[PDB]
Amino acid sequence: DRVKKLINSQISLLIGKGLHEFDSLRDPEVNDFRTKMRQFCEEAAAHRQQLGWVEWLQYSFPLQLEPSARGNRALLVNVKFEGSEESFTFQVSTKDMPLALMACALRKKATVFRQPLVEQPEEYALQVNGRHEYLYGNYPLCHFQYICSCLHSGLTPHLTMVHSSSILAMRDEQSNPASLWSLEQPFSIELIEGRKVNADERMKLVVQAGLFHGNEMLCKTVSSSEVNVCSEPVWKQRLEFDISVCDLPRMARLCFALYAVVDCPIAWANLMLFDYKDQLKTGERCLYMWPSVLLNPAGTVRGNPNTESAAALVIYLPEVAPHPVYFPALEKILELGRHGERITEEEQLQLREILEGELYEHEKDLVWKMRHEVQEHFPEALARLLLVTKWNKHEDVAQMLYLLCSWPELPVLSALELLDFSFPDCYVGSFAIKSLRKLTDDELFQYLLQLVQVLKYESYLDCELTKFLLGRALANRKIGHFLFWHLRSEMHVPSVALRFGLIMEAYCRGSTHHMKVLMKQGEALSKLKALNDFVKVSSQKTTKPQTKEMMHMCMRQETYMEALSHLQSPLDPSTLLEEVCVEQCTFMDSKMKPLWIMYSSEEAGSAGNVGIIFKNGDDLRQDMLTLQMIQLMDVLWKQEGLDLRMTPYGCLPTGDRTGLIEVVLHSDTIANIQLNKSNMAATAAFNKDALLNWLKSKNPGEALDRAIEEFTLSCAGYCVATYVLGIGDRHSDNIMIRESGQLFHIDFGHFLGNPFILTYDFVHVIQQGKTNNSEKFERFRGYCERAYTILRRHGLLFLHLFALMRAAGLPELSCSKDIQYLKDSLALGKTEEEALKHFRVKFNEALRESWKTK
Ligand SMILES: COc1ncc(C2=CCOCC2)cc1NS(=O)(=O)c1cn(Cc2ccccc2)c(C)n1
């Protein structure tokens, strides 16, 4: 009671909506989800408290492995023991494992402390200093991301020996407290009246209604008659559809569109015909309509929360039978689908050709006929077969479901295709999730953004995907972190606020301690929004140095100092944002005046000096998606042994036009480097030299050659990344360069088209200052070609991922026309020889554009 009230109030604070609002709906579906999902999440919390210390480290601190390790050299390492000021620096090998490194630190300590130790290397874990990152398991040292980062950046790994007891004590501190088929009658409804309708009185009103199974129409759309435009239009008419009640699939949805004709749309609303308990809906239903910007089947099946302002459409769902009618159970379906129906040698080859991607009408009749041959010989062709199935014929669906339920578990790639709205069947969705269960946390984390979007196409609150995502978030603290932030950022959207809000409440019941951690993070973002508003005002009246000192005063207050300090980074929970360095903080000159908040850690040293950018006024969803795609490219390339020294820095929308960006330290823009400022080391005689002179100055003597190599490699990666992804609006200010030579792009507002790019100032670097250096240039051309063909081998993965992101609601990613850019860029409808010929020609075409500068 005393703690139940507090947990509830903290959840309300955290999710940005009171739990009383949930109960105010007096909604069975909402109530049944809450009860069932609190129970499922409490079971998770209990499982966690009975984990072993290593399994608990796998929960709180999942391993950060190098892409090539997933599925020799000398190394200087610094080790200390938790509580001790003293440390040991020793030589290890990249091929050595943490148990060898621990056994070694236990020897040094045993000789310094003069006694043979009882403790064994198996009782310890290696914490990365001042980070929520550990090194454990039987993986050689080079396979860990931290060790790799260190090896490249020339820094010494600083590790701490954590005893199992310390980890177990840590666990306890973080513990939770204690029949349809007989009805041949056509589908009919009554369009009674409209309410709160606003439109031109010169025009007339009409209602268009259509029956959908996803996108595919179940029958012809039906329109009402033309009534006069007013606030309350009264139709009181019948709309009969050319489909029998028996043929209604489980996931059938009635779609409405209210518009004004002489063509202007007013509003849209849809609903499921069967409720969450599989009962066919009857009685009077009020559809609180959403504004239209003519049917929208993809749109949500829940009403517009703004009941006061919104237009309403009152409909009557007629009583079909004297008793309640439920959708048949799987047992009745697999019974009807069991009984069905030889094939010819030539039609067996015609099939092998069209299963190896739209088809003609006669081929559908062939893929349907050979459905058992599809299951047995081409199991990966499920999706094409599912698209030739008539979801308007109840026996054809029964036949399909009989095969799906015997169908083997598909690879992840195929299962991702099945999450598309094009496959709205629930037994199809459950099958897809069943085939995704084999995703590792690293694969899961990679596609997590796309899976949160898929949640928006869901017709009900209680689903296998919510159960899947919830179970995985509670079993891995990093997944839980990012599932929380993807949902939390979309709370300002009334169409997803209910589902996302209820999901986040469930997670919180399963993770009280993590709710407290995320509360600390929201508390910091609250102060930043308030510091940003002050900065936005102050800067329009006073000068930038003055506004900066005023920002520093405002930050120095008790509430600001406590909120902004000692939190886990929402960009990386492994990164602890410790001590805010007030003197180093500032903001950009742009419209939104984004804040640059700088942090330091006494515990983490060099690695604790981090920077975050708080942005308010701009939508950061497309930046995040692009950066995630660049990250995917990098993983894909590293898996094929290619490290193109990419910088896919963190970017996280946190709320309404609000987000954080990861500051890449020790980097500058080409614009600032090119400014060729006097009384600087880099001062060039010719602007073509500025970039190379800046590189020379940050990398003395022997180091310059490696910086030129870091530049070339990262240049090859971004040339391909921006080409494949259609990144435009490229200027010297949104192309950055790191002190180590790595080139990277920022600010991804325009992608998917909205020609390949090459600059002679980059070519000068690649060529080591030499005017003619085709040895070095062509090495770069080959880096592009190898990178491009690795991406094409995975072209389907980019397509399936981008397809799922149509649910996100991005204006530059909403229809098929957008994904055509990727189809063209990855030239997937061609052979590798025909695509590589096209890459070479586009690289040569981008070169002839560059040569105009030279
Ligand atoms: C989407 O917007 C952003 N995306 C990424 C960044 C990052 C900056 C550095 O670390 C990597 C991430 C920053 C922003 N937003 S902004 O308003 O700060 C910004 C700064 N700049 C040029 C600039 C950069 C650095 C130093 C001086 C000036 C531009 C063009 N935008």
Coordinates of C-alpha atoms and ligand atoms in Angstrom, one line a residue, residues 588 590 594 596 613 615 620 623 649 661-665 667-669 672 733-734 736 744 746-748, ligand 1:
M588 CA 25.0 26.6 -31.2
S590 CA 21.2 27.9 -35.0
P594 CA 21.0 23.5 -29.2
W596 CA 26.3 21.3 -25.7
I613 CA 23.9 17.8 -27.4
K615 CA 18.1 19.6 -29.1
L620 CA 15.5 13.8 -34.6
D623 CA 18.9 11.4 -38.1
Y649 CA 27.4 8.4 -33.2
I661 CA 23.1 13.6 -29.9
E662 CA 26.5 12.2 -29.1
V663 CA 29.3 14.7 -29.4
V664 CA 32.2 13.3 -31.3
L665 CA 35.1 14.9 -29.4
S667 CA 36.5 16.6 -34.3
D668 CA 35.8 19.8 -36.4
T669 CA 33.8 20.7 -39.5
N672 CA 36.1 25.5 -39.7
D733 CA 29.6 22.5 -42.3
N734 CA 27.7 19.0 -42.1
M736 CA 33.2 16.6 -39.9
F744 CA 32.1 11.6 -41.0
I746 CA 26.3 14.9 -39.6
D747 CA 22.7 16.4 -39.9
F748 CA 20.5 13.8 -41.9
Ligands
LIG1 C1 21.3 17.0 -36.6 O1 22.2 18.0 -36.0 C2 23.3 17.5 -35.4 N1 23.8 16.3 -35.6 C3 25.0 16.0 -35.1 C4 25.8 16.9 -34.4 C5 27.1 16.5 -33.9 C6 28.1 17.5 -33.7 C7 29.5 17.1 -33.3 O2 29.6 15.7 -32.8 C8 28.9 14.8 -33.6 C9 27.4 15.1 -33.6 C10 25.2 18.2 -34.1 C11 24.0 18.5 -34.6 N2 23.3 19.7 -34.2 S1 24.1 21.1 -33.9 O3 23.1 22.2 -33.9 O4 24.9 20.9 -32.8 C12 25.2 21.4 -35.4 C13 26.5 21.7 -35.3 N3 26.8 21.9 -36.6 C14 28.2 22.2 -37.1 C15 29.2 22.1 -36.0 C16 29.7 20.9 -35.5 C17 30.7 20.8 -34.6 C18 31.4 22.0 -34.2 C19 30.9 23.2 -34.6 C20 29.9 23.3 -35.5 C21 25.7 21.6 -37.4 C22 25.7 21.7 -38.9 N4 24.7 21.3 -36.6

